[PDB]
Scaffold this active site. Structure first.
Site, PDB file in Angstrom:
ATOM      1  N   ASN A 264       0.811  -1.222   0.000  1.00  0.00           N
ATOM      2  CA  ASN A 264       0.000   0.000   0.000  1.00  0.00           C
ATOM      3  C   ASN A 264       0.850   1.281   0.000  1.00  0.00           C
ATOM      4  N   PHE A 265       2.165   1.104   0.068  1.00  0.00           N
ATOM      5  CA  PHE A 265       3.112   2.216   0.036  1.00  0.00           C
ATOM      6  C   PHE A 265       4.398   1.895  -0.732  1.00  0.00           C
ATOM      7  CE2 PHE A 265       0.455   2.563   3.765  1.00  0.00           C
ATOM      8  CZ  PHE A 265       0.047   3.882   3.752  1.00  0.00           C
ATOM      9  N   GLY A 266       4.497   0.680  -1.264  1.00  0.00           N
ATOM     10  CA  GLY A 266       5.617   0.314  -2.108  1.00  0.00           C
ATOM     11  C   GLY A 266       5.336  -1.002  -2.789  1.00  0.00           C
ATOM     12  N   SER A 267       6.044  -1.232  -3.889  1.00  0.00           N
ATOM     13  CA  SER A 267       5.933  -2.495  -4.598  1.00  0.00           C
ATOM     14  C   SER A 267       7.301  -2.874  -5.141  1.00  0.00           C
ATOM     15  CB  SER A 267       4.896  -2.423  -5.725  1.00  0.00           C
ATOM     16  OG  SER A 267       5.268  -1.472  -6.700  1.00  0.00           O
TER      17      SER A 267
ATOM     18  N   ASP B 239      11.663  -3.284  11.614  1.00  0.00           N
ATOM     19  CA  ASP B 239      10.714  -4.090  10.838  1.00  0.00           C
ATOM     20  C   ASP B 239      11.231  -5.515  10.668  1.00  0.00           C
ATOM     21  OD1 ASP B 239       8.182  -4.228   9.705  1.00  0.00           O
ATOM     22  OD2 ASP B 239       8.848  -3.599   7.715  1.00  0.00           O
TER      23      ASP B 239
HETATM   24  C1  3JW Z   1       6.800  -3.343   1.475  1.00  0.00           C
HETATM   25  C2  3JW Z   1       6.086  -3.761   0.191  1.00  0.00           C
HETATM   26  S1  3JW Z   1       7.125  -4.663  -0.908  1.00  0.00           S
HETATM   27  O1  3JW Z   1       6.301  -5.471  -1.744  1.00  0.00           O
HETATM   28  O2  3JW Z   1       8.033  -3.752  -1.531  1.00  0.00           O
HETATM   29  N1  3JW Z   1       8.008  -5.668   0.020  1.00  0.00           N
HETATM   30  C3  3JW Z   1       9.462  -5.943  -0.160  1.00  0.00           C
HETATM   31  C4  3JW Z   1       9.224  -7.364   0.112  1.00  0.00           C
HETATM   32  C5  3JW Z   1       9.728  -7.790   1.487  1.00  0.00           C
HETATM   33  C6  3JW Z   1      11.176  -7.915   1.529  1.00  0.00           C
HETATM   34  N2  3JW Z   1      12.304  -8.013   1.561  1.00  0.00           N
HETATM   35  N3  3JW Z   1       9.663  -8.217  -0.963  1.00  0.00           N
HETATM   36  C7  3JW Z   1      10.920  -8.243  -1.433  1.00  0.00           C
HETATM   37  C8  3JW Z   1      10.935  -9.171  -2.440  1.00  0.00           C
HETATM   38  C9  3JW Z   1      12.115  -9.554  -3.267  1.00  0.00           C
HETATM   39  N4  3JW Z   1      12.035 -10.713  -3.896  1.00  0.00           N
HETATM   40  C10 3JW Z   1      13.089 -11.044  -4.629  1.00  0.00           C
HETATM   41  N5  3JW Z   1      14.204 -10.350  -4.801  1.00  0.00           N
HETATM   42  C11 3JW Z   1      14.282  -9.153  -4.150  1.00  0.00           C
HETATM   43  N6  3JW Z   1      15.266  -8.205  -4.108  1.00  0.00           N
HETATM   44  C12 3JW Z   1      14.905  -7.188  -3.335  1.00  0.00           C
HETATM   45  C13 3JW Z   1      13.639  -7.461  -2.843  1.00  0.00           C
HETATM   46  C14 3JW Z   1      13.244  -8.711  -3.362  1.00  0.00           C
HETATM   47  C15 3JW Z   1       9.655  -9.690  -2.550  1.00  0.00           C
HETATM   48  N7  3JW Z   1       8.864  -9.104  -1.639  1.00  0.00           N
HETATM   49  C16 3JW Z   1       7.763  -7.122   0.091  1.00  0.00           C
END
Ligand code: 3JW
EC number: 2.7.10.2
Length: 279
Positions: free
Chosen positions: A17-20, A125
């Protein structure tokens, strides 16, 4: 930097809801696969925070911290860790992940947090949802969206919320410190040794202990009372007593009594070595 004209969206990895985060192919000329973090609901405050998060990750170079790669025009580019979050990985592979392996991941998380402490960063976190799996032998702290830099003159940061991972003083005073990161690490250790089973998750356990009569603000109230009266998450099934004892030490109401990450790493390593050696 990265030229967006050569970035092709392939898959969504996470949509908050604030990043993807997206899986994209960067092929400037067959190219590489990268992870692309972008801002959702981008306000001036959120972009300011995202700029600082970018700077924090660029300053980190550690085997157990996701690798910064650069920025694109505003997006954050990193490496693509193909096994996803530890939550998905542990759920999928739980039958093959023995306690010696859980302690390998635990040790790696500990050493990443140890390294963060060196720079006077508070993660705020720490949870299995923010740990990524590179391969079966290496995990990395994967997100730093709430991470703060301690002020020169204090050993805590106050911030105006994953409450079931929060230390009591974070719940009451909004105070975050290395010691509140240690509290959350204790919850991560619980998550690992329950093998991320949802019915045993911290939110499910705490709500059963509180009562599901509660909603929102009152949940926080009865969580505070529960923790003040030394209610705690239970020992997971099969979890060695020595590992549960470490959890309970991280969960001390007295901030000064919680262990250091350096000491946590030393003990986790010793326990793992004893377990593998049969002593
Ligand atoms: C806070 C909302 S989000 O969707 O941006 N958030 C980051 C998150 C949790 C962590 N870490 N995420 C990272 C990945 C991920 N998968 C594969 N390679 C990667 N490289 C950097 C991140 C990464 C998949 N989901 C979920």
């Amino acid at each position: 930097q990265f030229e967006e004209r050569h970035l092709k969206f392939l898959q969504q990895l996470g949509k908050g809801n604030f990043g993807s985060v997206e899986m994209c192919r960067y092929d400037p000329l067959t190219g590489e696969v990268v992870a692309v973090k972008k801002l959702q609901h981008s306000t001036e405050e959120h972009l300011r925070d995202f700029e600082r998060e970018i700077e924090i990750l660029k300053s980190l170079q550690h085997d157990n911290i996701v690798k910064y790669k650069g920025v694109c025009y505003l997006k954050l580019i990193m490496e693509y860790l193909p096994y996803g979050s530890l939550r998905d990985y542990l759920q999928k592979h739980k039958e093959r992940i023995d306690h010696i392996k859980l302690l390998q991941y635990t040790s790696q998380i500990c050493k990443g947090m140890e390294y963060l402490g060196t720079k006077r960063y508070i993660h705020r976190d720490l949870a299995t949802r923010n740990i990524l799996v590179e391969n079966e032998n290496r995990v990395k702290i994967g997100d730093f969206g709430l991470t703060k830099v301690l002020p020169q003159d204090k050993e805590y940061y106050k911030v105006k919320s994953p409450i079931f991972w929060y230390a009591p003083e974070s719940l009451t005073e909004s105070k975050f410190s290395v010691a509140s990161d240690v509290w959350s690490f204790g919850v991560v250790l619980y998550e690992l040794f329950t093998y991320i089973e949802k019915s045993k998750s911290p939110p499910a356990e705490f709500m059963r202990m509180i009562g599901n009569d509660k909603q929102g603000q009152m949940i926080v109230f009865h969580l505070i009372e529960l923790l003040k009266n030394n209610g705690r998450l239970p020992r997971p099934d099969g979890c060695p007593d020595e590992i549960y004892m470490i959890m309970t030490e991280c969960w001390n109401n007295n901030v000064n009594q919680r262990p250091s990450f350096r000491d946590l790493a030393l003990r986790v390593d010793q326990i793992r070595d004893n377990m593998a050696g049969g002593s």
